[PDB]
Amino acid sequence: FEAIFGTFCNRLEWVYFLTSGLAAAAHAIKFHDLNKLTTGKMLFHVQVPRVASGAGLPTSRQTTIMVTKYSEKSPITIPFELSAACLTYLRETFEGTILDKILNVEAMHTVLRALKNTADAMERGLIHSFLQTLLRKAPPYFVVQTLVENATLARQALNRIQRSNILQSFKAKMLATLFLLNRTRDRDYVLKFLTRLAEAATDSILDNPTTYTTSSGAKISGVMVSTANVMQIIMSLLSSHITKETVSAPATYGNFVLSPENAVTAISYHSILADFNSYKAHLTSGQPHLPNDSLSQAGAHSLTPLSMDVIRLGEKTVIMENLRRVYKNTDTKDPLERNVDLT
Amino acid sequence: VENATLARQALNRIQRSNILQSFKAKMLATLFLLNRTRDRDYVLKFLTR
Amino acid sequence: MDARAVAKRPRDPADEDNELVTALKAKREVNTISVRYLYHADHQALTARFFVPEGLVEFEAQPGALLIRMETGCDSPRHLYISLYLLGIRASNVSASTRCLLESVYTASAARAALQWLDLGPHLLHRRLETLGCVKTVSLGITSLLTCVMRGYLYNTLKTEVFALMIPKDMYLTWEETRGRLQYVYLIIVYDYDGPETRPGIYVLTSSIAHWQTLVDVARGKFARERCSFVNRRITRPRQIPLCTGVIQKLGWCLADDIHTSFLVHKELKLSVVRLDNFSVELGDFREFV
Amino acid sequence: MAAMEANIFCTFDHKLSIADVGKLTKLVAAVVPIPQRLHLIKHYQLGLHQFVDHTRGYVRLRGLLRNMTLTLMRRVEGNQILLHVPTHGLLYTVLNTGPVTWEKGDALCVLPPLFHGPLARENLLTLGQWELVLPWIVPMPLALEINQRLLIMGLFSLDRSYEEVKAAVQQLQTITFRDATFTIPDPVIDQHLLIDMKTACLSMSMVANLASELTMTYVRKLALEDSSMLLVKCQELLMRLPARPQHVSPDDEIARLSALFVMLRQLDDLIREQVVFTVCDVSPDNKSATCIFKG
Amino acid sequence: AMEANIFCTFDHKLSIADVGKLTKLVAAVVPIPQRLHLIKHYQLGLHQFVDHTRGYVRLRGLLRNMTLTLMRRVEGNQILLHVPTHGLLYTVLNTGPVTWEKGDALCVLPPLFENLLTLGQWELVLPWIVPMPLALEINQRLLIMGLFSLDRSYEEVKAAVQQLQTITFRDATFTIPDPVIDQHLLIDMKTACLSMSMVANLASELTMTYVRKLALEDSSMLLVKCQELLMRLDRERVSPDDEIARLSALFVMLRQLDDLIREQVVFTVCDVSPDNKSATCIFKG
Amino acid sequence: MENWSALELLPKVGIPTDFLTHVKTSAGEEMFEALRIYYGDDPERYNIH
Amino acid sequence: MENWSALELLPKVGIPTDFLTHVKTSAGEEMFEALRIYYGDDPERYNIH
Amino acid sequence: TQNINTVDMGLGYTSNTCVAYVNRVRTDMGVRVQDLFRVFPMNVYRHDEVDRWIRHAAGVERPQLLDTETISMLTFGSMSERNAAATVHGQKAACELILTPVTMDVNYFKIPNNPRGRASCMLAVDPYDTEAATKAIYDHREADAQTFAATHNPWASQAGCLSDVLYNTRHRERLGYNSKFYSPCAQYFNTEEIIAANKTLFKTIDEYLLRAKDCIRGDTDTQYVCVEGTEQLIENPCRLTQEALPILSTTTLALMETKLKGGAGAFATSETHFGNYVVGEIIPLQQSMLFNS
Amino acid sequence: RRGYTYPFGDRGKARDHLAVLDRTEFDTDVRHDAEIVERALVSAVILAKMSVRETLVTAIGQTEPIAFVHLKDTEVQRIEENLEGVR
């Protein structure tokens, strides 16, 4: 005889956007009516201090700039398929025999398993798309370092010599740092490179002050991601500064909804101003400044803890995570494995 | 181990050539490991890997 | 079988649960997906998906147009999906201004290759082309996605609005002064054999006539000059084998009151078109008349 | 604004008797033509009687009927008749109006009625010098033979004298089909038929010119050493007056024969009617059948 | 929720391996002779129609009269066939030797060639699904090879027949069968070829009189050019009852050729898998 | 053109922030999608319709 | 140019209006500015954005 | 479908990317120069016997393509040469060869430089001044940047010279051009693209992130350009700098033997004999890449 | 023209020999005519032999000789005597 031992079905592992460290880089708000609109704009009003000039020299003027920020759309899709057998047996019975019961169980489990797999794939696609939009906008290291060294040296639109110097710094630092981990491993150099890379970015506009806090110590600021190999190298090298920690994260998406005064303006003038009643109250009360923005109001309330790695770059704390899990056995190439070419 | 993340598809010719380059490099590097070096950190890293 | 079951009213998809809802009800499980109501569930129109190069998409960025499949004998992509508006650049039934405008607008690289393939072969346009009905979405890029209906009422996903079909003004032809409330619309190709080239004309014809014999009778009546040209080339030049002074294809039924005249804008250039809003597609094959 | 109606109600306005509504009930599931489609129409527009004129040219009636729309009759009740327009491809039931026998597996066409026997059956709602004259549903061979004989008679009318034409017309007026026989009413030659004559003769001369040497010589060559009743009949029809073929060129020959194929199609379309019905199994009494509506 | 279906019972026993062989044809096309509800397996396919004297065009005519059906799941002791209705869409298996592209038009042809499962006095055979231009080309080539059947002795005819026999299409280069056997013609091919040649012959000597009579009146004036063309053809080279018989012969011979003149546009195709054997399409009358 | 007067008149949320480069350089070098810059005081905000 | 979708969707006050002429003539002869004369039921009022 | 909408709540750049760790090289780094007859398949010599002799001696088969219509299809784009039998090394790195005078100052190679002989970085020129940029990139009667001579390669710099008409993708279209081949120096001669690219600094780097990148097929031995979507684009610092890198090359085996014989750090130092020289790689790639391999 | 119209078992070789055949107008020089007619005649003979599907000498360098095909012995004798008289 021929013996068949135990048959195994794959124990597929689930993953979520919120449970991943990348969620700390993100603010997540859920909005059931998103399909209808295609425009999202924010506005910034800033007045720049002017130092009182000395005698004889040209004097400054009271000056302001007004700037707006716009929305990027990037919907994601996943198909899944059902055969005729499942579709016809899911809604039919034949004589009520045992084999028909087996077929019904198989069809129901097949369709529900397909739905579960599609939901997991949709979550993976959402985190993938967020990484896509984050990485497509991040500039490289040498340009941001050249910018951070030149902060004071321009106070106007760039003149010719200044941008020539910018280009010189570009070329020098590009030759200096086209690769990092393969060239030098003296821990001081790599740690100082990491802290420079962190300090280069400007901080976020809207803090969620009671999110992604360390369990007791302090508040987290940055999130950085790499493939498993680079993460292993860094963890081996920087072991003195590496710590384990439990952090608090929002357990669910934040809910944002239309108040009726928003709906009437939607119908009338094709526009909504968020947190409308707060605007009307603080306007008629004659007060200039609001406690919170609508986005921060939309933020979720409950907190749940989860474990992740964190290191110190000097008064700044940044999150470690390697995204190998989200593409462990999938199709698409992990976006963090980039190709760079030279001439 | 190193080439696990680059292709979960039908293994293409160029990836195969890279596999062979890694073969040629690492076979020469680790033929007589313990004879070659007794550096404690390196041998622990090799065993962990 | 029982009398009550036979007499019972027909099954009601109108309020009965969708299959996914039935399964999730059965196991008592909930996914994050808004599983209850399926989009396109009530759709009667048959939909196809087509990929097209970026050059041809112009004038399709506005929804509604005829999408035509043209042949090329090369090993590399054998078919190219072309729009009726671009096809007018070849027809001799287009005014000089409109042809110049279309020639200026479609000067993308891919379009001119299709124009070369159209006239680089011995065969006439009749054997080379085939119709795919009406196109109704855009997703731009280096390669763009089109979705198209081959047996349809022409509508947006939620059916929130009907989508019209636009025909360029120079091609539009009518053979009756009064219109019955129902009339069909056809695609018409005729050939001029007197010129050195087999010079083709492109026409779109609306008529209240559904029966083939009388429609062909009227067509031969109006196209008498072209028929005489065919006979003249046949007698004049032996060992040549011309055929089918004109061909007909049936493509549409529409309610005559719906017809309107409208302008169409793209690349801030302005085109003149005729418009049919409450349109539907019915597709037949090409057929020959002499 | 407008909507294309599919359910059509016809209302009478003559003070009908009981026998009229009785005969209406007999007509259930028959086919009737309408010139225009509305939700409620008057009886005067229903039926073919509105078109008849003293000239009574059969070709005129055929051409007029070709343009019309076809509908089926359902749920006959007092002075209100419901007509349902057919939808292409669906399965419908129909009761044949004329006496022509049907068979399963063939196709049917629409034609104006014919003179048959004593001309007894005109009882169809004769009221107020108006009557419900229904069109005929007949199988494909009979319709093709009718069109063939009308066109052939029209062609023969030319190049012939009056009495020769009269004899030929009196012969061609008859038809035989499936153990039945019928007579064509008023097949007078008219300008409508002259258009068909012109287009048919043009197509026939084109097929004559496009024919290649091999196609023409095939029949004469085969008569040399083959023999059968079909062959002897075909040879007897033709006029009476080995070698290597004069020219061989499959490319030019295939182009020529394709052009001749198109021309033969064009000549054939003159007699082919619109194929309205494809039939399924029929009740053995021949009265009613199940059919699919096409075209 | 059930739908309209046709039940078929295999009168011969089917082994498990044979059922597994047949199940690979989930959505292939199968013709049936008559629209019964419970059909016997002998009626399926085109095997009962094949004959040793009757030819290909007879099969084409019978297939035109045939009713087309689509297959459904095979199960215990019974197989289910779904008859299509116009303007819905269905899945078909490309049994033909020609690959398809989006927007192709298809028509059904009688077959010309693994093999399909057989029984003691039975084999199962299915028709071809082919794009329309290739169907025209193959019918034209097979008919023209029917014409050359008479002259086959000379070597020119053999070379020309060989050249006509090969057909080329998109990544397809198969060969069609020679319509002659033992230097003889199958009788249906003889009838079709003779009918075409006769309808060609009759028009050459019949049109002149009727054309020259109509020339006096045509305001469209191209009929006179037609007369001149016929006279140029003449330069290149009766009792009324005989005349009327000749006209009747012309039209009956033309009707005989109508078996091959028009094409049923059965299917139009929607996008196809790389499994290209399988494709989706919309059914047309 | 956006309704800048709405931005000026309506209440705001106070956020301390600093650009990487100098603010005037970021506006002058075209980094933002749309800009409105005025020197002194533009009375346009006081006119409403 | 007028937001007709707003007029359709928004609530409205009932009045017994009395046009001097037959109302279809007033629409036909452009007594008012900015008309809209859709026949049947026009579903365009639903596409809220 | 789950349509997500993102707003960038960052005034300045809030996120940075860097190339941390480098793996093995997909290209052979070799001198295995590419076939011009494949990229220009149209042209033939006038007298057919001369064409036969040249094609026989050169090692390239006479091109034949179905009918005339294939030439339009090829111009639209088609991969049209066979993969090699075996590949122990990776892709055949295409070398383009641009004619160059004998007298060229050899020091031009020893630094990161533009191979066209005329420095043309668009972060230097004034923004949106096409006239000034054209003057900088073509006008050889005004001093160049980075080397204040008029040019270091007369046959490669001028608008009408060899290396512009041959390499520039907009000019190349005037001749037989298979678009599928990624010409290495295409990005150094697309004067139209370079003139279009000279936007303001912030928008320049934004475009560099968005659209300046290109793609290369991973399935094939040779540098085929791909349709965007199947494989992600390639980051290119050289495109941003409009410069090129120098690689260790020597014109005699003795100096290469010294480079191999010498200890660590010998790769980055240049040296010259009477008529032979070494140009050292400016980045220590040959050591670092093999260090981890 | 006859080469264009005729079918063949291997069309490519026939097309190549027709291409070397179909443009042979004389270059108005006494010397050149003999060599060009020699080449054209070689092409014509090889095309005829391929049309008959007679064997043809494919050996390298050993080009097909100039000869008649399928002509009777009496006629070829007469033609050869006429050519001897021409000499």
Numbering used by the authors:
A (entry chain I): 50 to 392
B (entry chain J): 197 to 245
C (entry chain W): 1 to 290
D (entry chain X): 1 to 241, 253 to 306
E (entry chain Y): 3 to 115, 122 to 245, 259 to 306
F (entry chain L), G (entry chain H): 1 to 49
H (entry chain I): 1078 to 1370
I (entry chain Z): 89 to 175
Paper text:
Composed of a diverse array of proteins, the tegument is an amorphous aggregate sandwiched between herpesviruses’ icosahedral capsid and outer envelope. While tegument proteins in general are well-differentiated to carry out highly host-specific viral functions, tegument proteins related to the capsid vertex-specific component (CVSC) have in recent years been identified as key players mediating critical functions universal to all herpesviruses. These include in HCMV the CVSC proteins pUL77 [pUL25 in herpes simplex virus 1 (HSV-1)] and pUL48 (HSV-1 pUL36; also called large tegument protein), as well as pUL48’s non–CVSC-binding partner, pUL47 (HSV-1 pUL37; also called inner tegument protein). We resolve atomic structures of portal vertex-associated tegument (PVAT) and identify multiple configurations of PVAT arising from layered reorganization of pUL77, pUL48 (large tegument protein), and pUL47 (inner tegument protein) assemblies. Analyses show that pUL77 seals the last-packaged viral genome end through electrostatic interactions, pUL77 and pUL48 harbor a head–linker–capsid-binding motif conducive to PVAT reconfiguration, and pUL47/48 dimers form 45-nm-long filaments extending from the portal vertex.
Comparing subparticle reconstructions of VC1 and NC1 portal vertex, we observe analogous PVAT architecture characterized by three distinct layers of tegument protein that stack successively atop the portal complex and its integral DNA translocation channel. The resolution of our VC1 portal vertex reconstruction was sufficient to identify components of and build atomic models for most of the visible tegument structure, which revealed that the three tegument layers are each a pentamer of dimers. An innermost layer consisting of five sets of pUL77 dimers constitutes a portal cap directly above the portal complex. Above the portal cap lies two large tegument layers (LTLs), each consisting of five subunits of pUL48 (large tegument protein) dimerized with a subunit of pUL47 (inner tegument protein). In our VC1 structure (containing packaged viral DNA), the last-packaged genome terminus held within the portal’s DNA translocation channel contacts the underside of the upper pentamer layer. The end result is an inverted funnel lined with (positively-charged) arginine and lysine residues—namely, R234, K236, R237, and K576 from both pUL77-u and pUL77-l—that capture the genome terminus, presumably through interactions with dsDNA’s negatively charged backbone. Resolution of LTL was sufficient in our VC1 reconstruction to permit atomic modeling of pUL48 and pUL47 within LTL’s lower layer (LTL-lower). In their entirety, our LTL models show that pUL47/48-l and pUL47/48-u from the same asymmetric unit stack to form a tetramer, notably in a manner that exposes the tryptophan motif TQWPAM on pUL47/48-u dimer. We noticed tufts of filamentous density emanating from each pair of pUL47/48 dimers in VC1/NC1 PVAT.
